[PDB]
Amino acid sequence: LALKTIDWVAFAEIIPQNQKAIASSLKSWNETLTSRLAALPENPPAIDWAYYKANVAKAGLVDDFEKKFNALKVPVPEDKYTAQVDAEEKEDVKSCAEWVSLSKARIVEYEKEMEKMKNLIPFDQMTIEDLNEAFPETKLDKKKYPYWPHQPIENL
């Protein structure tokens, strides 16, 4: 019974909006099972036979009642459910690490671009083609507007 202590807000941030109900039900059952392990002790008090040896005046029935108990094989339930959530955790960690490598690719591209923008030519020594290759939003659509001024007259 060595449990994994959990943050609950952290648990909240990682739940997609198609299974919020399941997250809350898992949480409520966590709390319910904590409560129910609280309100029942660990091992039953095995009553001494003494109060049932020296005050049960019946012919050996108490003794077989106690032998059938000392020899009982009470069924310990096995997991049959934890191994598959371990497999699901492995599959999820696979997906997570691959998505992280993708985001690191995007981040190195963004850092390259911010180094590009940080080392721009001063704007007073900049041709117009340098601007059209720095901020390509500033390029005249010589495709749609083929004739001068290459833009709508109202834009001017």
């Binding site: 019974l1 941030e13 990682i14 029942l40 009982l72 934890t82 923008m117 020594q125």
Partner: protein, 198 residues
């Protein structure tokens, strides 16, 4: 390539200062002006510049031009300079704005990585619940088996107890009811003890 800052230092809008410097060493500070005066007077005196209606047309145009530059020159200079400062300021803010956009994108990506690092709680929660449910059921089973065996044994002991009780009750009240069915000695002995009262 950056432009210089200042031009070429003309004088009266017509003659660059390079000329006045070039004639300084040989004719002092008054050489250029003596030369200009001499050339004007030679052009006049010899009909190289013919005074006509174009003299006064030219004077009026030159006066209008000098007044124009002197009065609306400060304004035009400041207008051009402000146009350039506004384009420059707009460009600087657009550059910084793109920097900030991509920095925000980097921050967002690192935040997503923080979330995906926090992911594992869903599965340790499920494992918590599986283990806790199995343990709850185990302990409930042990309490059930205990309590059933104890209840049977205590039912035996309770029937024994109340059996003894009803039997002892019938015993004592039977023996009274049956001694009632059963002595001059005590007749005299009562007065004997009354005498022994003293």
């Amino acid at each position: 390539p950056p432009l210089p800052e200042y031009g070429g230092k003309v004088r009266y809008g017509l003659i660059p200062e390079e000329f006045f410097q070039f004639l300084y060493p040989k004719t002092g500070v008054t050489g250029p002006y003596v030369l200009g005066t001499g050339l004007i007077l030679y052009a006049l005196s010899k009909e190289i510049y013919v005074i006509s209606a174009e003299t006064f047309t030219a004077l009026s145009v030159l006066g209008v031009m000098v007044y124009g530059i002197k009065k609306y020159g400060p304004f035009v200079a400041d207008f051009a300079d402000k146009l350039n400062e506004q384009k420059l300021a707009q460009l600087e803010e657009a550059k910084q704005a793109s920097i900030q956009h991509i920095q925000n994108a980097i921050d967002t990506e690192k935040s997503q990585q923080a979330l995906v690092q926090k992911r594992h709680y869903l599965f340790d929660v499920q494992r918590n619940n599986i283990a806790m449910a199995l343990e709850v059921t185990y302990r409930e089973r042990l309490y059930r088996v205990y309590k059933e065996v104890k209840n049977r044994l205590d039912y035996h002991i309770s029937v024994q107890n109340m059996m003894r009780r009803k039997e002892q009750e019938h015993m004592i009240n039977w023996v009274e009811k049956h001694v009632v069915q059963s002595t001059i000695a005590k007749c005299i002995a009562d007065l004997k003890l009354l005498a022994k009262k003293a």
